[PDB]
Amino acid sequence: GGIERVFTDKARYNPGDAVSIRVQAKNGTGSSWSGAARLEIFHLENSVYTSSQSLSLTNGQSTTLTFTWTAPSTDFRGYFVRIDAGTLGQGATAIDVSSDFTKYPRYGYISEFESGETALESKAKVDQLAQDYHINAWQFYDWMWRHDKMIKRTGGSIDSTWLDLFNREISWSTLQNQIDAVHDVNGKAMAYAMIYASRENYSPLGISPTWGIYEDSSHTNQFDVDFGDGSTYLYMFDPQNPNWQNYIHAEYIDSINTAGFDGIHVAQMGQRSNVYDYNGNSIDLSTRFSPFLDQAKSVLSANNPARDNLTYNIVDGTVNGWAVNDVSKNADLDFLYSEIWYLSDSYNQLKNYIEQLRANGGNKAVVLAAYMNYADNAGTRYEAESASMTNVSTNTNHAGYTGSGFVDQFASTGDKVSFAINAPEAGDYSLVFRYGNNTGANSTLNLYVDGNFVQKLYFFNQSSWGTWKHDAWYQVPLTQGAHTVELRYESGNVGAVNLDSLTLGTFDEHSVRLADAMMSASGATHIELGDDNQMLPHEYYPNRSKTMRSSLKNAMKDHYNFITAYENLLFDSDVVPNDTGSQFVNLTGVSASGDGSANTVWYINKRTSDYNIVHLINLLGNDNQWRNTASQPSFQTNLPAKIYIGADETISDVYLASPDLSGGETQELAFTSGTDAGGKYVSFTVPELKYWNMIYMLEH
Ligand SMILES: O[C@@H]1[C@@H](O)[C@H]2OC[C@H]3O[C@H](OC[C@H]4O[C@H](OC[C@H]5O[C@H](OC[C@H]6O[C@H](OC[C@H]7O[C@H](OC[C@H]8O[C@H](OC[C@H]9O[C@H](OC[C@@H](O2)[C@H]1O)[C@H](O)[C@@H](O)[C@@H]9O)[C@H](O)[C@@H](O)[C@@H]8O)[C@H](O)[C@@H](O)[C@@H]7O)[C@H](O)[C@@H](O)[C@@H]6O)[C@H](O)[C@@H](O)[C@@H]5O)[C@H](O)[C@@H](O)[C@@H]4O)[C@H](O)[C@@H](O)[C@@H]3O
Ligand SMILES: O[C@@H]1[C@@H](O)[C@H]2OC[C@H]3O[C@H](OC[C@H]4O[C@H](OC[C@H]5O[C@H](OC[C@H]6O[C@H](OC[C@H]7O[C@H](OC[C@H]8O[C@H](OC[C@H]9O[C@H](OC[C@@H](O2)[C@H]1O)[C@H](O)[C@@H](O)[C@@H]9O)[C@H](O)[C@@H](O)[C@@H]8O)[C@H](O)[C@@H](O)[C@@H]7O)[C@H](O)[C@@H](O)[C@@H]6O)[C@H](O)[C@@H](O)[C@@H]5O)[C@H](O)[C@@H](O)[C@@H]4O)[C@H](O)[C@@H](O)[C@@H]3O
Ligand SMILES: [Ca+2]
Ligand code: NA
């Protein structure tokens, strides 16, 4: 109804802090409305607070109510917030009372630092992530001038702007305003920094090649990253080297003390093998990160124990993967972080990996980078062969295209392809072109939207006309309704392309919801939101090649309310797998599985001292792969469940909460206790299963 927003002023609260709960209400009923707005706050099954205010609104008028609440004294507790305004409608949010974000991290990012961004605008984008998703830490991505010289100075003076490695202008005042805004919501700012990277031409900085790591035993070929312009490179160094540690840890401290960061997000490039030090000693790089990290933590904590937060990216996460055991078991990190590539493609394989990190780390929190739909040209597609084209024609003579063909020889001034699209709602749209190019170099075309020039786009060379890509994209704001998107070959464009299609790059809500459910039911969170409410499509965080539509935004608001409100049941140290015992889940009238099998309801059994926890994740109508696009699950109603429990257990009450249902509010279910040949059991009916239900059963 007319409850438009419910939220709090900060993302996280210390015990005893005042919480301002805001309620944005609008009357759109027809005539005047009078009544009460009732607040109820729950901790898991138990109500802990109520209050009410009268609310009278003429038709069409709006107001924001404020309810004040003192964060209760027990540290590390999540709460669900219900606002009930009768026939005007209802709303919800969640509250996290934690003195330390690293126990329950909800990790977002900032990757854009434009000088034109005002203090107000910096505050707005941070507030929005804080308010909508309770984001409590932000990874500041590519804020630094050089990987080995993070704050650019002229003599003793900090430069007001600098150009990053991709020639983006970074504004100091904008960065500082964002950090301030993060702190204002009780958030923490984590500075991206590599564990072992310099930029090119590092000698004049006092960095020695003798600290480096090499691909050969004669120190002639230093490990590097080559960005493809003959100018911009990273060079790699030995994390165990005392001089490299001295140098880069000094950079970390400079970043903390000068820029006001609260910690370092330590990064790497992932597996590199057959590594040597300068002197030609063969070295296993995978075990060299933990001594570096232990020492980084030491110097950080000595400098400022309130700004000493530390994590490290375990790149290419999978069970027993590269550096997985050494870092997770041995590194002095506050929480664990891992970027998943292609070694944990199934839901169950990824679950197993999260569980290994949790076990190895002593139940430290686990955050995953896991770019949704990364490989997919996901979204509404307009085939180029069905568009309106001038001076080019269609063809079918290169395999790989989608639809009935493609537009070919898009190669001369006057050539045009015009797409008639529809924006179903006002917002940003990612314009993604699928194309071919085997001209021997880059090709270009000019992008126009509704008759206006927007950008020259680059279309990269492939060694075959049979090789298609969809990495030519540009994001634009569109009003709701019809629009025209044109590519034109004009005076100044070069080469040629074959054009397959235009796609409105869009994150698939179904896969994104199921992945987030699987991750948090398994005991991890997911770095996926940042900047001005952008979802993360790619490892280069400024990438805007897909966008979220409002439906997914709303589901993420519900999801983040859920993993905040129920953080105790999802992420606590005592929340452990319950596959170790005599117990079983039985669902009537659906195929079920304990290993995330395709086209089943997937059950996951957890426990604490006080609760027997069963997650139901609905894979009916979908495959067992976490990353790819999915269909809407086959939603279920009145699903009978029978759960076997230990002879030791008696259940007081059965509860079910779902982000999909009433905003995550817990419903108590009637249940029957019984014992048969199979064992002691409990049974009940699940009223609804859409994507994800968490059943939690209180022990007597
Ligand atoms: O400031 C930022 C910089 O610090 C830097 O950050 C990069 C990201 O760092 C993290 O992600 C790490 C990494 O994860 C995955 O790789 C893990 C993978 O590594 C091995 O496989 C290597 C490689 O094999 C194949 O290519 C062969 C190719 O490999 C080397 O070149 C690698 C690429 O180097 C250049 O591009 C670098 C970088 O540029 C952009 O990112 C900018 C940021 O860089 C910057 O903001 C791109 O967006 C990004 O995609 C790209 O990595 C070249 O321009 C590019 O062409 C190369 O591919 C080698 O040097 C070269 O000689 C070889 O020819 C394979 O095709 C390729 O996909 C794979 O990466 C190891 O064997 C595997 O086991 C292991 O799984 C990703 O694949 C990789 O892209 C990521 O960089 C952070 O988490 C990210 O947020 C950072 O963006
Ligand atoms: O089945 C066959 C098709 O696959 C296709 O094969 C093309 C060639 O493939 C191999 O060589 C790969 C090689 O190509 C280029 O160098 C060779 C090139 O050199 C001269 O042209 C120099 C010219 O190069 C660049 O422009 C190229 C091209 O761009 C526009 O067209 C794009 C379309 O190209 C193809 O169709 C047009 C094609 O049609 C006939 O060839 C049929 C074969 O094509 C077919 O059997 C013509 O004889 C040929 O001249 C013409 O290109 C694709 O099929 C279509 O999908 C693409 O849209 C442009 O309109 C056109 O005029 C250009 O020729 C560069 O941009 C430009 O500046 C430069 O001047 C020589 O005159 C050409 O005849 C020759 O092809 C790349 O430069 C190089 O990097 C690649 O590795 C075979 O070995 C060749 O035998 C094939 O011709
Ligand atoms: Ca096509
Ligand atoms: Na899938």
UniProtKB/Swiss-Prot annotation:
In this protein, which residues make up the domain named CBM6? 380-505
Has keyword Kinase?
no
> Which keywords has UniProt assigned to this entry?
Glycosyltransferase, Repeat, Signal, Transferase
The record's pH note reads: Optimum pH is 5.5.
One MF annotation (Gene Ontology) recorded for this entry: carbohydrate binding
Q: Does the keyword Glycosyltransferase apply?
A: yes
Q: List the EC numbers from the record.
A: 2.4.1.248
What is the reaction catalyzed?
A: cyclizes part of a (1->6)-alpha-D-glucan chain by formation of a (1->6)-alpha-D-glucosidic bond
Quaternary structure, from the entry: Monomer.
Q: Which family does it belong to?
A: Belongs to the glycosyl hydrolase 66 family.
In UniProt terms, what function does this protein have? Produces cycloisomaltooligosaccharide from dextran containing 7, 8 or 9 glucose units. The enzyme is specific for (1->6)-alpha-D-glucans (dextrans) and, without activity toward (1->4)-alpha-D-glucans, such as amylose. It also has no activity on oligosaccharides, such as amylopectin and pullulan, containing (1->6)-alpha-D-glucosidic linkages at branch points.
What is the name attached to this protein's record? Answer: Cycloisomaltooligosaccharide glucanotransferase
Taxonomic placement: Bacteria, Bacillati, Bacillota, Bacilli, Bacillales
